[PDB]
């Protein structure tokens, strides 16, 4: 499959760079 190579690394930073932000914000709220 002639897919974008960086499409993997675009997919995973698109979805875990915000995610860790949320967890940071949640964890500091819970503590």
């Amino acid at each position: 499959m002639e897919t974008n190579k960086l499409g993997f690394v675009a997919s995973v930073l698109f979805v875990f760079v915000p995610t860790v932000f949320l967890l940071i914000l949640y964890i500091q709220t819970a503590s």
């Binding site: 499409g7 993997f8 997919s11």
Partner: peptide
């Protein structure tokens, strides 16, 4: 490796769904 991303993200939706049902914040009456 394109299916791997899709399956990993779908596992992330499923994990969030489990944790938002099972380990949800309790709604307390006032």
């Amino acid at each position: 490796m394109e299916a791997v991303a899709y399956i990993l993200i779908f596992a992330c939706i499923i994990g969030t769904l489990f944790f938002a049902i099972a380990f949800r914040e309790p709604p307390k009456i006032t």
